């Protein structure tokens, strides 16, 4: 009966993973009707594909082995191991690819998914000579050797690398659709680490100093948790299934420009106009320096030139003409500063 219970748990895990990832892939395919080859779609699609490979070659072998008393089948006997390890590498390499893409999204304006796939495939090639006939043994010391290799390549090294990349991501963010997608990738990383930490912890333990099925189950739960996190974050797939500091400086300088415009339009004489335009000049140069740069600084060139025209009119005693020249600043602001403010939805 306990064997049947283990069979039931494994079959349920297989169902959850295969169904969630197939549904996410179907939602992405349906979005494909709109030409939405968005960068995030291919990454999460191949992440779900990696979770599908995991489900098909981690749970199914386990199910077939729990039935009768071994994985009946030698070429396939080791091929299963190869594919399994392929999925084990991909389950973190796709997250690393996503974190790299989120880094890029706030940097200079597919290849990395194929890079992750190539790593997950090549780094599993030893499984085609480690395991061989009855059932397959990993004979050859070999325990700490391959255990350390697997624990580092699959879990520890990509965890620290992705941590460094996420620190770089906050580095560029700190210096908000991208922030939301960064948070999604962060939740994916956290779930991956929590699911897989005890697995390699005890593997290395046995490796240097000599009930695993519970850890296999908890680890495999990550490949069903990921797609639902993505569905929670991504509005398109959810529908189908049913910079910062520079921006703050820009906001401060634009608020200063607006307050100076308020001072100008209510001004009575040339002196207040000149003072407010002086503050306008300072604020506009400061904003022109900050990054949301060709059309940005060009728009601020126009703003400063209009401020200068208003200053020339004010110095000649033409207060009202200076006020009109300052009113042109509202037109320039609406033309350019609003577009630059729109960058806050990307952050």
């Amino acid at each position, epitope marked *: 009966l306990l064997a049947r219970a283990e069979l039931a748990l494994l079959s349920i895990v297989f169902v959850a993973v295969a169904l969630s990832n197939g549904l996410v892939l179907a939602a992405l395919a349906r979005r494909g009707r709109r030409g939405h080859w968005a960068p995030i779609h291919v990454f999460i699609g191949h992440l779900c594909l990696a979770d599908l490979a995991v489900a098909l070659f981690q749970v199914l072998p386990q199910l077939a082995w729990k039935a009768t008393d071994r994985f009946r089948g030698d070429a396939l006997c080791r091929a299963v191991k190869y594919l399994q390890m392929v999925g084990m590498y991909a389950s973190s390499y796709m997250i690393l690819a996503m974190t790299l893409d989120r880094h890029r999204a706030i940097c200079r304006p597919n290849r990395p998914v194929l890079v992750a796939w190539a790593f997950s495939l090549l780094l599993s090639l030893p499984q085609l000579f480690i395991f061989a006939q009855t059932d397959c043994w990993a004979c050859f010391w070999g325990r700490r050797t391959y255990v350390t290799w697997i624990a580092l390549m699959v879990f520890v090294a990509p965890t620290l690398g992705i941590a460094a990349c996420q620190v770089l991501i906050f580095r560029e963010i700190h210096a908000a659709a991208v922030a939301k997608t960064v948070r999604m990738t962060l939740v994916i990383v956290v779930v991956y680490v929590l699911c897989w930490a005890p697995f390699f912890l005890v593997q290395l333990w046995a490796a240097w100093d000599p009930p695993f099925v519970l850890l296999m189950l908890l680890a495999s739960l990550n490949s069903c948790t990921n797609p639902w996190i993505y569905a929670s974050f991504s509005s398109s797939v959810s529908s189908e299934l049913r910079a910062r500091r520079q921006l703050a400086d820009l906001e401060d300088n634009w608020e200063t420009l607006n307050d100076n415009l308020k001072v100008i339009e209510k001004a009575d004489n040339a002196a207040q106009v*000149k*003072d407010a335009l*002086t*503050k306008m*000049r*300072a604020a506009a*140069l*400061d904003a022109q*320096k900050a990054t949301p740069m060709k059309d940005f600084r060009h728009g601020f*060139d126009i703003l*400063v*030139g209009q401020i*200068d025209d208003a*200053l*020339k009119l004010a*110095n*000649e005693g033409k207060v009202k003409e200076a006020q009109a020249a300052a009113e042109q600043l509202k037109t320039t602001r609406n033309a350019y500063i609003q577009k630059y403010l729109r960058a806050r939805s990307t952050l």
Partner: antibody, heavy 124, light 109 residues
Framework: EVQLVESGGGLVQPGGSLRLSCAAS????????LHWVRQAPGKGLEWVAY????????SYADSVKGRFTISADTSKNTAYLQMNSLRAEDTAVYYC?????????????????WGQGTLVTVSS | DIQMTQSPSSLSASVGDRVTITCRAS??????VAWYQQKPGKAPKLLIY???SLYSGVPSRFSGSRSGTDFTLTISSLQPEDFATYYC??????????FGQGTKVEIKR
């Protein structure tokens, strides 16, 4: 070669009517606004006035408003500062300086060229 | 409207010393501050513009710096040619030009 050459100084009475001439070479007075800056002997630099010979007005410091007048000639490529009702307090060395127009580097490189000083002495 | 203030009116240093002069603008101005070097009997010569940029032809040992309304001129290693007067100015607009009081670098003995 870019240069500013000031002339027309010397000794005048405390009644003014002294005209200083700043000739320009290399950079035309049309392309750059021209400023006169005053330095009393033993004292620091004090801005006096400026003119945009091609696109705008003339501005003066509060210390000289009502007395100094700046003009320019774009065909002689020169600028003039006329000082009336000069006082002994205005005895100083006067410098003619360039300043470019917004936008670009020419505006940021304020007073790239000062030419030379011309001494104006006001005493009875 | 905008006043420039300098504290180190008299700076005594020997050849090779690294020297620093400060200048504060009275308003929340942009990087429109400049540094000039003047020798007695000669017109001032531009050293620093944009409050951080080295003017073409100026020896590389000069360096400017901006922190809000405080601006700094440094000489990495004083030469005997650098014992002169130095001025800071605010050049926010043509009608707003104002200079500091000036600082003089003299030989430490």
């Amino acid at each position: 070669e870019v240069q500013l050459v000031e002339s027309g100084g010397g000794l005048v009475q405390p009644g003014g009517s002294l005209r200083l001439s700043c000739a320009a070479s290399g950079f035309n007075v049309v392309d750059f606004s021209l400023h006169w800056v005053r330095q009393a002997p033993g004292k620091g630099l004090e801005w006096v006035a400026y003119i945009s010979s091609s696109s705008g007005s003339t501005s003066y410091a509060d210390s000289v408003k009502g007395r100094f007048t700046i003009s320019a000639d774009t065909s002689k490529n020169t600028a003039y500062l006329q000082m009336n009702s000069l006082r002994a307090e205005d005895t100083a060395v006067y410098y003619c300086a360039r300043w470019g127009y917004w936008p670009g580097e020419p505006w940021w490189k304020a007073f790239d060229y000062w030419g030379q000083g011309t001494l104006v002495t006001v005493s009875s | 409207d905008i006043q420039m203030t300098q504290s180190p009116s008299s700076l005594s240093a020997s050849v090779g010393d690294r020297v620093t002069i400060t200048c504060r603008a009275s308003q929340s101005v942009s990087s429109a501050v400049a540094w000039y070097q003047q020798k007695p009997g000669k017109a001032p010569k531009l050293l620093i513009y944009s409050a951080s940029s080295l003017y073409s032809g100026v020896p590389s040992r000069f360096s400017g710096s901006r922190s809000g309304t405080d601006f700094t001129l440094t000489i990495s290693s004083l030469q005997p040619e650098d014992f002169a007067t130095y001025y800071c100015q605010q050049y926010l607009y043509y009608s707003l030009v104002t200079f500091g009081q000036g600082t003089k670098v003299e030989i430490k003995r």
